[PDB]
Design brief:
heterotetramer, A: mainly alpha, 58% helix, elongated, B: Non-ribosomal Peptide Synthetase Peptidyl Carrier Protein, Chain A, 4 helices, Gag polyprotein (chains B, C)
């Protein structure tokens, strides 16, 4: 995964 | 507070761990490249024996959902 | 501008490699505990193979000074 | 090798 994967799932 | 200290407990459900990880990292002060790299590195490196085994097995190209499903349990 | 990208050339003096690592690292935006971590991981990790072998043969307890003395020329 | 070692070596 990437940081972008975490932002889509858990949010900014 | 440091993303470096976010470590998964032996009995802690993976999704619980990734949750703590994601929320520490978003509030973490760093560039975007670093956060990707921390995500590509620390998340796997700080997981518990079994979830580490399962993640390394999936590969750097693994997707979060793939990881979720495999570790569901 | 990323610290993650600082890599030692095959024929670049290790003297010059660590010089750039420091300038980039201190310019980078991160917690001090993250900077500590980038130093202990990335500095050796991104050395040229020749130096990597030497730096791994020095042990994780070598000082920056010792590391210069080995990788000379 | 710590980050403070780099600052001892390179300074400000």
């Amino acid at each position: 995964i990437t940081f972008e994967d975490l932002l889509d799932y858990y949010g900014p | 507070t440091s993303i470096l200290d976010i470590r998964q407990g032996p009995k802690e459900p993976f999704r619980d761990y990734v949750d703590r990880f994601a929320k520490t990292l978003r509030a973490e002060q760093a560039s975007q490249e670093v956060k990707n790299w921390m995500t590509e590195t620390l998340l796997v490196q700080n997981a518990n024996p079994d979830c580490k085994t399962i993640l390394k097995a999936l590969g750097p190209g693994a997707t979060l959902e793939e990881m979720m499903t495999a570790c569901q349990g």
